Amino acid sequence: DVFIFTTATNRLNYFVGGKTYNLAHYTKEMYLLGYLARDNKVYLADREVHVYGYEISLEVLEFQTLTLRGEIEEAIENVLPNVEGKDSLTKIARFLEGQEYYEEALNISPDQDQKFELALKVGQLTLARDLLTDESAEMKWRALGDASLQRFNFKLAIEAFTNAHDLESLFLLHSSFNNKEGLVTLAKDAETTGKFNLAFNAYWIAGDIQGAKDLLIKSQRFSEAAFLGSTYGLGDNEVNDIVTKWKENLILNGKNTVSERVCGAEGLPGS
Amino acid sequence: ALQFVQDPHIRFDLALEYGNLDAALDEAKKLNDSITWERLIQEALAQGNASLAEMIYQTQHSFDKLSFLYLVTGDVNKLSKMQNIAQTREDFGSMLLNTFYNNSTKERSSIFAEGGSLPLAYAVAKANGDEAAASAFLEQAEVDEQDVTLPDQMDASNFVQRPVISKPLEKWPLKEA
């Protein structure tokens, strides 16, 4: 059922169920000689009659024949037990993935990376997590967070994005679930990362006015700190300290004249 | 008497030094420079003149900065119009930003909806006890309704400060001097 063949381009391929797979390629015109079930390998030869042999897995070829025929269970229970080495297992695994059979591919694959990836595809979130330690790849934890959030598993998404240090996604979660300590922690994190906008919004939704104010001040945005302060009733003493700093900054920048025209909490209409 | 000073760029420089914002805007409108507008806005903010910063923001189409100014300024009203602009402009990041400032979690859930994130639309409606629409989301998403692993604890959005003042503060109080 599987047609093995040589190409005009010097490649050794095989065709099955409408699919074409590459086995190898040579730098000389090869001509197929035949397959020896005994040695488990194909034999070719060039024009000068030099014989070459390539090892193929009759099991792998048969597993594929069945799968593409709609008889994968048959392939899994009859052919799979005779598959040797993980190199062959990995082949079947990647062939199965390339066939949408993520579930079964997850079971066959010996490659941990592929496993994790496959688990996300089929929603086996727990399995996936219990497959990543301090496994560097913050990019994997994010992939895990996205996967979880896709399947409404917020609790896991939250854990993934946190370890992934993906502050944008984590913010969407903590802000939606009004987690004041999460927000405040994320902001400080955002500040360390220069994510000044994110930080302000995190502090804001958390209701951490004091945090938001100091953020603005550390950025020399004193007038804005003053507006925020008086608009959200921080208190005159509070507001006046911001004004004092606003004025000191002005003087440090040589704008002494403007510095002296700035009123304190007093001038603010009906405190 | 800056009218007579020779170079428009120089006029702008002097206006800023003398703190003359009226003259600075005249040179700004004409010189119509991106860098110039940015220096002017910076000068307005140094004097607490939010009105001018707003002015320059509108004409220079920096809506998110407009929204932030309405926030610290207590302009609750104008803050919604920024929603209608961020909407009729296809910018989910913005229509969402205004809800962080408006604390309108009902709009936010809806935004996450068309936004293409039912899970979040749900998360918002849920924590904010809007049980009604939360299910409509779950339904609409073909989600089990029982595999939805919420976090151990939630809370509605009540930690957000509110305007203590009545009227927005358009300019910060300055002496005649």
From TrEMBL, chain A:
User: What residue intervals traverse the membrane?
Assistant: none
Query: Where does the record say this protein resides?
Result: Cytoplasmic vesicle, COPI-coated vesicle membrane; Golgi apparatus membrane
COPA/B TPR domain sequence ranges: 63-247
Coiled-coil intervals? none
The record's comment on protein family reads: Belongs to the WD repeat COPB2 family.
Q: Which function does this protein serve?
A: The coatomer is a cytosolic protein complex that binds to dilysine motifs and reversibly associates with Golgi non-clathrin-coated vesicles, which further mediate biosynthetic protein transport from the ER, via the Golgi up to the trans Golgi network. Coatomer complex is required for budding from Golgi membranes, and is essential for the retrograde Golgi-to-ER transport of dilysine-tagged proteins.
Describe, as the record does, how this protein assembles with itself and its partners: Oligomeric complex that consists of at least the alpha, beta, beta', gamma, delta, epsilon and zeta subunits.
Q: What name does this protein carry?
A: Coatomer subunit beta'
Recorded source organism is Saccharomyces cerevisiae (strain YJM789)
